[PDB]
Design a protein around this ligand. Sequence first.
Ligand SMILES: CCN(CC)CCNC(=O)c1c(C)[nH]c(/C=C2\C(=O)Nc3ccc(F)cc32)c1C
Ligand SMILES: [Cl-]
Ligand SMILES: [Cl-]
Length: 338
Amino acid sequence: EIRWRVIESISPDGHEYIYVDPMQLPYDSRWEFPRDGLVLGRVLGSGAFGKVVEGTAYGLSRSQPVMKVAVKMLKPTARSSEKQALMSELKIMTHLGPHLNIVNLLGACTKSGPIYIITEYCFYGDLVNYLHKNRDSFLSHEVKNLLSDDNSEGLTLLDLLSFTYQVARGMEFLASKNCVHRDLAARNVLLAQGKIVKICDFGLARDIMHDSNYVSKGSTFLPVKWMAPESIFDNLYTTLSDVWSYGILLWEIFSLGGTPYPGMMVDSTFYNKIKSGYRMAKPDHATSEVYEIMVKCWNSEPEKRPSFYHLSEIVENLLPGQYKKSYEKIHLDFLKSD
Ligand SMILES: CCN(CC)CCNC(=O)c1c(C)[nH]c(/C=C2\C(=O)Nc3ccc(F)cc32)c1C
Ligand SMILES: [Cl-]
Ligand SMILES: [Cl-]
């Protein structure tokens, strides 16, 4: 099963959303890539129903003819409905199109054997792991030119703001396609060479059962600490509830990978506190301004939360003018790729 959902229509009220169904959408066979060409490496992440594997693609890209990529595939056991869910994920990726700040679809092997989804390889791994690895090196404080490069220096507040801006940009693209993530968290944000953040669903390769954050509910498991109240209590997911998750994500970022609501376990009294209006306090490294962003995203009234487009502007003003220049260039280069 896949978490991602694209909105097709809303009732006039509108208390009823209608989500596109992937199986309805057509798989463009242009994406097909010969299996022999692909080479499979060590497994990036393994879970209950499949895994993501590092790999190398030859001739997949005109720009880069020898490319390193991450491949998603189902386990052999391969329950038939799961096989459709992977095609579904593939169709959704095709429908959304590409963006700099998502893990992008590159190709697929669907014709003769297990289905393979080829995707961008993110050299630095998940954001949460990366923050933990660079925790001790953190100092607050031509620094701007280095930010969107692989050059080696201590993690700084500019980096954290760069991650913040890019995730917002990523959401805007997603929001702009009426796509609701429903599992936005630092564990679902990967980092690519050049320090480009890429939002993605880890779901098929990750196992929820082993992961501590997910809490059981009606035969499913929910990222409760990242969920807006309407998602918790009323089971409604919108772009506005993703904005809530984004605020929690910023807390993760500016606490250098801390667990949200530290010391608080998800129980009867937790739900009462979220319903009470409890919000987290400012994390240690959060600038006064960023915390204001977190608070705005945590508004109890969903329509009062800022739009993802709006957030990008707010973060852009917390960053030097040269950074936006550097991002626009990398934006164009990415679009010209291949
Ligand atoms: C750094 C230590 N890590 C274990 C804690 C192992 C190192 N590497 C890692 O974690 C790692 C890296 C470097 N990439 C991934 C996963 C993906 C990746 O890169 N692109 C993707 C695209 C799609 C996808 F679904 C997963 C990945 C991991 C888990
Ligand atoms: Cl855009
Ligand atoms: Cl731009």
